[PDB]
Amino acid sequence: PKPILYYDERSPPVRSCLMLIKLLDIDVELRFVNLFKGEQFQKDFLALNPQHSVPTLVHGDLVLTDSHAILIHLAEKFDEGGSLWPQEHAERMKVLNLLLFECSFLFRRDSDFMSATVRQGFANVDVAHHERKLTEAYIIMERYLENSDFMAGPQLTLADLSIVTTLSTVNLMFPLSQFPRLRRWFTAMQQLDAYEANCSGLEKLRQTMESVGSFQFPSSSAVVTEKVE
Amino acid sequence: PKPILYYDERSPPVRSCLMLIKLLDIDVELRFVNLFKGEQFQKDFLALNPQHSVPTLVHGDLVLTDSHAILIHLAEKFDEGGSLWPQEHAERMKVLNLLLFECSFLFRRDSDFMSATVRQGFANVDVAHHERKLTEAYIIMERYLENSDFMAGPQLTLADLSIVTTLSTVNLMFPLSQFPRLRRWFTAMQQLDAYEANCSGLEKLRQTMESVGSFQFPSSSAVVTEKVE
Numbered sequence: 485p486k487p488i489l490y491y492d493e494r495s496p497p498v499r500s501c502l503m504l505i506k507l508l509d510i511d512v513e514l515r516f517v518n519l520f521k522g523e524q525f526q527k528d529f530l531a532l533n534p535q536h537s538v539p540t541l542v543h544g545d546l547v548l549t550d551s552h553a554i555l556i557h558l559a560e561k562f563d564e565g566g567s568l569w570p571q572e573h574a575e576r577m578k579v580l581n582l583l584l585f586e587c588s589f590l591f592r593r594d595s596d597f598m599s600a601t602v603r604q605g606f607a608n609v610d611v612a613h614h615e616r617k618l619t620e621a622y623i624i625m626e627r628y629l630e631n632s633d634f635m636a637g638p639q640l641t642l643a644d645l646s647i648v649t650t651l652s653t654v655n656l657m658f659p660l661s662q663f664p665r666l667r668r669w670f671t672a673m674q675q676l677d678a679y680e681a682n683c684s685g686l687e688k689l690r691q692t693m694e695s696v697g698s699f700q701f702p703s704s705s706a707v708v709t710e711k712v713e
Numbered sequence: 714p715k716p717i718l719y720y721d722e723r724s725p726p727v728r729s730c731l732m733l734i735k736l737l738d739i740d741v742e743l744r745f746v747n748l749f750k751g752e753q754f755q756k757d758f759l760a761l762n763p764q765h766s767v768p769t770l771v772h773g774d775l776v777l778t779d780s781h782a783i784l785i786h787l788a789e790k791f792d793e794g795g796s797l798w799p800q801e802h803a804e805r806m807k808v809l810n811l812l813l814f815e816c817s818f819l820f821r822r823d824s825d826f827m828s829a830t831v832r833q834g835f836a837n838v839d840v841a842h843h844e845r846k847l848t849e850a851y852i853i854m855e856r857y858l859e860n861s862d863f864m865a866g867p868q869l870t871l872a873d874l875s876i877v878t879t880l881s882t883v884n885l886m887f888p889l890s891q892f893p894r895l896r897r898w899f900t901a902m903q904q905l906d907a908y909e910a911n912c913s914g915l916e917k918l919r920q921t922m923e924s925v926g927s928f929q930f931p932s933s934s935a936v937v938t939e940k941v942e
């Protein structure tokens with residue numbers, strides 16, 4: 485049976501999966517779990533995914549509860565022999581290493597800042613603390629791009645899809661004026677037709693955060709190319 | 714050339730890699746990076762791994778900066794066709810999904826609690842908050858063990874090696890009296906000869922945390938079997 489994706493498009497890891505689904509033209513079923521209404525605690529969803537997180541994928545008897553596993557699974561089943569999840573071991577391990585940087589470092593710090601803002605209100609967040617932590621992630625990604633125009637090498641991989649959604653989300657708040665390779669990479673990712681799958685949920689997240697957090701993101705921070713405007 | 718592991722054995726993800734290296738009898742080189750003295754910021758290590766984290770593995774030109782990538786890489790190179798990282802796609806995706814639970818959920822919450830304790834002192838930590846967050850991880854792992862005696866099924870996998878080190882670390886602080894399947898699994902993991910590679914660094918972490926945090930872990934919390942005593 486075809487895969488079922490449980491999602492809230494405001495979530496960056498969800499958007500990474502939506503981008504892969506569009507890029508590979510995968511036929512999936514969709515289920516909307518509204519995180520800002522606590523629907524991830526609904527008894528059937530919680531029994532499915534005890535971590536109460538999106539994205540979640542059901543594919544026959546296989547239940548995946550992490551975007552990075554979903555990206556790998558979908559690439560292996562719907563892009564066998566492709567370049568997004570390369571067959572060469574060293575190349576594949578570099579993509580895996582970068583998926584784990586997204587999970588462990590970039591998303592962790594984005595999520596800490598955004599979660600604090602929803603729970604406490606923007607006025608009660610240590611914004612300078614979060615600016616340092618997220619700028620530190622920008623420094624790292626600028627270094628990852630020193631010798632290549634994509635995160636894992638000269639070609640688009642799953643790592644770019646995982647990172648770009650969270651990067652777009654961080655960049656609602658923190659500008660890309662001092663990270664030229666990162667800004668150029670983001671600009672290039674915005675020209676991909678698959679990037680259209682990031683746009684609705686990024687904008688919904690922007691509006692939801694400004695409402696629930698009682699603030700406005702700095703209008704100058706977000707990088708918005710002509711194609712996406 | 715043989716792999717080089719950069720490590721501090723106090724780190725649970727480091728200990729997962731030490732356990733795999735012992736289990737598979739892998740010949741690696743070792744480099745000690747003392748995290749409690751800031752040696753992860755030494756210029757050569759920071760150039761190698763901009764995330765300033767252990768474990769880091771150098772294997773020829775391949776540089777891995779995440780325990781979960783290291784576990785997968787080492788299983789693929791030193792246990793090809795084995796059961797720790799199974800070849801069957803659905804089984805492999807279940808192990809991957811659990812490695813990502815360790816990264817995203819269990820380690821995130823352990824690290825938040827332990828990092829707060831080092832930075833602020835135990836007296837300045839919201840222990841009840843961290844107890845709730847880590848008990849929630851215990852609830853999830855008890856559910857993962859409802860139908861199997863290892864985390865991903867009836868056999869030891871990389872998921873057990875990744876999870877047991879962080880679980881042992883959480884359980885210095887929070888008891889396993891209300892999580893019987895999880896306690897039984899931990900007791901079983903302690904009987905594996907590879908578990909000996911967890912013991913020195915768990916004890917060093919216990920002593921370092923009590924010194925730097927100015928507290929004592931509850932002596933009753935840790936589960937310590939006869940083999941490990």
Ligand SMILES: N[C@@H](CCC(=O)N[C@@H](CS)C(=O)NCC(=O)O)C(=O)O
Pocket residue numbers: 494495496497519524535536537538539549550551552587817
């Ligand atoms: N490592 C996970 C992170 C998933 C995650 O934390 N998603 C958030 C939204 S960005 C979520 O579902 N939050 C709801 C909750 O934790 O209750 C992945 O990559 O899928």
Ligand SMILES: N[C@@H](CCC(=O)N[C@@H](CS)C(=O)NCC(=O)O)C(=O)O
Pocket residue numbers: 588723724725726748753764765766767768778779780781816
């Ligand atoms: N997701 C990473 C986590 C690595 C990590 O954060 N390790 C800690 C020790 S438990 C570290 O090196 N901390 C030093 C620092 O962040 O400066 C992995 O699995 O390797």
